[PDB]
Amino acid sequence: RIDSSLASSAGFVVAGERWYYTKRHFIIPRYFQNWRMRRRKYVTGWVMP
């Protein structure tokens, strides 16, 4: 989960750390975290053309 502030402030009113998507609410994706970002341990090889 960590942090999900990867997205920009599109559609948000920027006020300091506050991304006001509405006149009455804002989010802080630095804390507003609701995505489970996943990472695996892959295997890969190099092929020369």
Binding site: R1, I2, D3, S4, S5, L6, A7, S8, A10, G11, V13, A15, G16, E17, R18, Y20, Y21, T22, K23, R24, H25, F26, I27, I28, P29, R30, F32, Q33, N34, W35, R36, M37, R38, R39, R40, K41, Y42, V43, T44, W46, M48
Partner: protein
């Protein structure tokens, strides 16, 4: 051998994130703030920001050993274990027109 790589298309908007209700009733950067329910914000905006996060995480680098966020603000976390596997070197061949 192994290397850590992102898992594209395996991240979902679980909903364990609370948008912050503003006490001031306006766009004041400061002031007391609340923990409000996720349902208040539109689903279209939620999907847009999730798509932006996915593009930032996966599309920025497919197979690399990037840096993990010191404060956790990573944009796609992957790793290389042991000595990173080198490109079989780009075979430049030169011919000059006399």
């Amino acid at each position: 051998m192994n290397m850590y790589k992102w898992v594209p298309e395996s991240i979902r908007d679980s909903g364990e994130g609370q948008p912050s209700y503003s006490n001031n009733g306006d766009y004041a950067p400061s002031g007391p703030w609340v923990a409000a329910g996720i349902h208040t914000m539109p689903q279209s905006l939620r999907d847009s920001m999730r798509n932006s996060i996915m593009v930032t995480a996966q599309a920025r680098r497919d197979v690399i050993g990037p840096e993990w966020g010191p404060d956790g603000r990573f944009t796609g976390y992957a790793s290389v274990i042991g000595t990173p596997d080198p490109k079989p070197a780009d075979i430049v061949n030169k011919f000059t027109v006399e």
